[PDB]
CSV table of N, CA and C and ligand atoms in Angstrom, one decimal:
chain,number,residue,atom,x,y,z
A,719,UNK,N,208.0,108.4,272.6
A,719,UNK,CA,206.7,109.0,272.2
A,719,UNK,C,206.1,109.4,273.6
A,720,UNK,N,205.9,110.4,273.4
A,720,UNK,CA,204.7,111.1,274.7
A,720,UNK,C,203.6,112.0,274.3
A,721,UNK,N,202.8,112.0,275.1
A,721,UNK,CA,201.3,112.4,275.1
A,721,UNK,C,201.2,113.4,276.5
A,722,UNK,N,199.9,114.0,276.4
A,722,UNK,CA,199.8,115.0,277.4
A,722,UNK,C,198.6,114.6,277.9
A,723,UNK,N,198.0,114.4,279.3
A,723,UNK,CA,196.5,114.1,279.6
A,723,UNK,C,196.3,115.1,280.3
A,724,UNK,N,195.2,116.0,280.4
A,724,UNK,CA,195.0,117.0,280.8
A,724,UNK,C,193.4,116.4,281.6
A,725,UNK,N,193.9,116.8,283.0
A,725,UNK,CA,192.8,116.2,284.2
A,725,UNK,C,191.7,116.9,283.6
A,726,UNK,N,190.8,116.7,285.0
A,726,UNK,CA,189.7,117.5,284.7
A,726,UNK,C,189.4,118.7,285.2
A,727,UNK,N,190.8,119.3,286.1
A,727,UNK,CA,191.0,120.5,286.6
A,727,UNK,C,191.9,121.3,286.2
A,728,UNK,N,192.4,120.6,285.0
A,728,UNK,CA,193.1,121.2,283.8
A,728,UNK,C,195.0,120.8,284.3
A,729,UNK,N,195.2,119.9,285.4
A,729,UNK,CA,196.1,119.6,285.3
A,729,UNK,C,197.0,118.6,284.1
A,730,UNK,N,198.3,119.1,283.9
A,730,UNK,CA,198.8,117.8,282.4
A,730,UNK,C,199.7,116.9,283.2
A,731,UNK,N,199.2,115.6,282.8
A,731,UNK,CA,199.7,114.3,282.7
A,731,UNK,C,200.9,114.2,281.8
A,732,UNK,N,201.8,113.8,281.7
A,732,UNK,CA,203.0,113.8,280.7
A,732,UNK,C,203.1,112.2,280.4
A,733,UNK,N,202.6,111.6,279.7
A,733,UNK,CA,203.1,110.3,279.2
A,733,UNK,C,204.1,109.5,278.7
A,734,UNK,N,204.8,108.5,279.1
A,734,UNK,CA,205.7,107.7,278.2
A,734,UNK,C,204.5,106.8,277.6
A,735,UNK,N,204.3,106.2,276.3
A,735,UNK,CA,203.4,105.8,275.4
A,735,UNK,C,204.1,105.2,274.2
A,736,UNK,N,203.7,103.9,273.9
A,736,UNK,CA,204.3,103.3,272.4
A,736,UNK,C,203.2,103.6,271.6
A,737,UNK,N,203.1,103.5,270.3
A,737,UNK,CA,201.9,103.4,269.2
A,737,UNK,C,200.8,102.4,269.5
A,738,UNK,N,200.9,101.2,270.1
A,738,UNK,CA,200.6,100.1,270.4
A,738,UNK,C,199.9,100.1,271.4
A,739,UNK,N,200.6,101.2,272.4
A,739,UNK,CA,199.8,101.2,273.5
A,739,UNK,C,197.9,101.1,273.6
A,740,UNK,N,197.2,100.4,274.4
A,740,UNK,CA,196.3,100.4,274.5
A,740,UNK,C,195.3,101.8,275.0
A,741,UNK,N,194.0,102.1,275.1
A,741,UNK,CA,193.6,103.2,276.0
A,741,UNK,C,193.9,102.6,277.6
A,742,UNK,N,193.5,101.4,277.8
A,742,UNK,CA,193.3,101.2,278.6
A,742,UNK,C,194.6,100.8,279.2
A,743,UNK,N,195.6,100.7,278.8
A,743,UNK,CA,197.0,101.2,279.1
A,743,UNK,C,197.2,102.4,279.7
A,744,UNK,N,196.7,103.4,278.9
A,744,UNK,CA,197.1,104.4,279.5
A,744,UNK,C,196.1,105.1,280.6
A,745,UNK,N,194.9,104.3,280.6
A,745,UNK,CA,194.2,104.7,282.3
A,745,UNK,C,195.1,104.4,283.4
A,746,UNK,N,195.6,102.8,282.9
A,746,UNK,CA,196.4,102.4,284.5
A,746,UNK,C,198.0,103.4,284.4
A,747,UNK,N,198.1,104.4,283.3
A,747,UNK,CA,199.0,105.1,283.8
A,747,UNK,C,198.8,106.1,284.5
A,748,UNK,N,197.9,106.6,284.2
A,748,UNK,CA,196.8,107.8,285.1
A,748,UNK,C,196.5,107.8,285.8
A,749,UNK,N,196.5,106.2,286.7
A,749,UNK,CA,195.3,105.8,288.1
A,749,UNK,C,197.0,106.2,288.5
A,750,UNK,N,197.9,105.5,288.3
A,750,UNK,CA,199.5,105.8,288.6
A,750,UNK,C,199.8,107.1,289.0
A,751,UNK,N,199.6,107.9,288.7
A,751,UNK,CA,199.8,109.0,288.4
A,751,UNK,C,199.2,109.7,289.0
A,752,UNK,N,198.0,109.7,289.1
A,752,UNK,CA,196.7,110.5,290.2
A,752,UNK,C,195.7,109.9,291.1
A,753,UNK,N,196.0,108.6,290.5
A,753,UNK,CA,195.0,107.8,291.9
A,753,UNK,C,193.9,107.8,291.3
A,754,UNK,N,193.3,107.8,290.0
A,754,UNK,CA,192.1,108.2,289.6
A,754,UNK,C,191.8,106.5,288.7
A,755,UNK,N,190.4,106.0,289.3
A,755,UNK,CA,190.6,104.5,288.9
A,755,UNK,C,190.2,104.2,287.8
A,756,UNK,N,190.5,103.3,286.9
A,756,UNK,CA,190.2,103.4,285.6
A,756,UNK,C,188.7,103.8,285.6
A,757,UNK,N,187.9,102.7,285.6
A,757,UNK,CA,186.3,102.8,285.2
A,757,UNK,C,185.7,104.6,285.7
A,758,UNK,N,186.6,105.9,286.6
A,758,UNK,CA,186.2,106.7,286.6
A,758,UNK,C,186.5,107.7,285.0
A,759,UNK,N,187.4,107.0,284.7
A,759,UNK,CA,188.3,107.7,283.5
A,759,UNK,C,187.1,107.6,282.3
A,760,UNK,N,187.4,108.8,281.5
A,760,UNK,CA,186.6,109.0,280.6
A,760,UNK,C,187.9,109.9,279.4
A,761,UNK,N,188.5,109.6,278.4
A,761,UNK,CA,189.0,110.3,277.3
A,761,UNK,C,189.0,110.8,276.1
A,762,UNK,N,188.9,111.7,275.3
A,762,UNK,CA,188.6,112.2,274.4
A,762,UNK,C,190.0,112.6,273.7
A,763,UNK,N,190.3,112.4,272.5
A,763,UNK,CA,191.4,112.8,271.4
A,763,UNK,C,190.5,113.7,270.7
A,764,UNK,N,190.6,115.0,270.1
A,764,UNK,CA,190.1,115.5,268.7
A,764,UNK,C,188.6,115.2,268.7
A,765,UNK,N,187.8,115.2,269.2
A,765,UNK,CA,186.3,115.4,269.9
A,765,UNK,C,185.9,113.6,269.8
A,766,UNK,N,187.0,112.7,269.6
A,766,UNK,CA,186.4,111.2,269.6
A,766,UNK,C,186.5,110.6,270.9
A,767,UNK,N,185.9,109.9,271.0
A,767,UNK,CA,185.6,109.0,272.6
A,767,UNK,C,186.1,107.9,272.3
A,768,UNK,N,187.3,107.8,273.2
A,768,UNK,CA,188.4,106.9,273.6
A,768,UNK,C,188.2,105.7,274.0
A,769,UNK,N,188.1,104.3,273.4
A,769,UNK,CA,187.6,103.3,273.8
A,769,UNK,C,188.8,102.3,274.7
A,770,UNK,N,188.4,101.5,275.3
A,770,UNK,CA,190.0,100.6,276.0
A,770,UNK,C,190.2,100.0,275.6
A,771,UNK,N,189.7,99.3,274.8
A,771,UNK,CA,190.8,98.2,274.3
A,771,UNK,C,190.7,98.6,272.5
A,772,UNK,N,191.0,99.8,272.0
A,772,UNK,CA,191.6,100.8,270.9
A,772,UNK,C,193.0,101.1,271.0
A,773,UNK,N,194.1,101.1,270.3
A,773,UNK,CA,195.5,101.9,270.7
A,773,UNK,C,195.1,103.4,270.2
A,774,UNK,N,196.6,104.1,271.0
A,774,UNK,CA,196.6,104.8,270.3
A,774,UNK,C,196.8,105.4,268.3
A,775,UNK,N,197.6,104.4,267.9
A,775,UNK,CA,197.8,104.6,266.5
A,775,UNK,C,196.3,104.5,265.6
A,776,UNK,N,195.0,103.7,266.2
A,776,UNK,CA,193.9,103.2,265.9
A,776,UNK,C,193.5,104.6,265.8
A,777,UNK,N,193.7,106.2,266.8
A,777,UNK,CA,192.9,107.2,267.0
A,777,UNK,C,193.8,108.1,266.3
A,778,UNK,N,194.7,107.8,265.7
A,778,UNK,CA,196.0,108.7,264.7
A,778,UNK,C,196.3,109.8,266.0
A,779,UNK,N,197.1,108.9,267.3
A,779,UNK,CA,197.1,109.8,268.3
A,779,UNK,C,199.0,109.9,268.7
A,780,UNK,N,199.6,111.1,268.1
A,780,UNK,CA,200.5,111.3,267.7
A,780,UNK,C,201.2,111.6,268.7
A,781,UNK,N,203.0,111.3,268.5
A,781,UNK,CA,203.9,112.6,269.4
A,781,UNK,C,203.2,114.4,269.7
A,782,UNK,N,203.3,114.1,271.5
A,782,UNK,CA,202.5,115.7,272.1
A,782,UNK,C,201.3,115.6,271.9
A,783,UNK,N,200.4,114.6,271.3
A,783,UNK,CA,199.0,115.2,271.4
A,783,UNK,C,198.6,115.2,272.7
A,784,UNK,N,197.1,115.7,273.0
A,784,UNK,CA,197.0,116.1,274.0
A,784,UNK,C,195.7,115.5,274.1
A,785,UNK,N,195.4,114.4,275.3
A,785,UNK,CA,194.0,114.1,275.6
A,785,UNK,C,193.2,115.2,276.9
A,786,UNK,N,191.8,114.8,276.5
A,786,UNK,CA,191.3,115.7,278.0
A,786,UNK,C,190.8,114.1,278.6
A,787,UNK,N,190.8,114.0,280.1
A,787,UNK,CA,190.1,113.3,280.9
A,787,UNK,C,188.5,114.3,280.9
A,788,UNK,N,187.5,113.5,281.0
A,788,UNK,CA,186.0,114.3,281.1
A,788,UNK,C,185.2,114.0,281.4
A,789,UNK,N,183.6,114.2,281.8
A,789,UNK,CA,183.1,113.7,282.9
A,789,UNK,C,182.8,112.0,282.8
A,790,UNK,N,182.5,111.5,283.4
A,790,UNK,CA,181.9,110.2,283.5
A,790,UNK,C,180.3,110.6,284.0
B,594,ZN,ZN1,206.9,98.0,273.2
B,595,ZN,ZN1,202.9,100.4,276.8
């Protein structure tokens, strides 16, 4: 399973991701990824606000979807 995170300069993030995975799982894949520290991270699925300790399966967040990172 993979996901798309799309920065906030419109760059995409390409995820490896289980169902299980946490949000806040996948910030520390992001900080990985861009250096960007969690507590700056802010995400959105389908106009909902992405909590950390929610999985993905909790936000029916599927193969390819696509998150935006957004302001803090
Ligand atoms: Zn696993
Ligand atoms: Zn995981």
């Amino acid at each position: 399973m993979q996901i798309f995170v799309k920065t906030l300069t419109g760059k995409t993030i390409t995820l490896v991701v289980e169902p299980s995975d946490t949000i806040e799982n996948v910030k520390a894949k992001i900080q990985d990824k861009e250096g960007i520290p969690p507590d700056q991270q802010r995400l959105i699925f389908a106009g909902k606000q992405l909590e950390d300790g929610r999985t993905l399966s909790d936000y029916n967040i599927q193969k390819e979807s696509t998150l935006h990172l957004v302001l803090r």
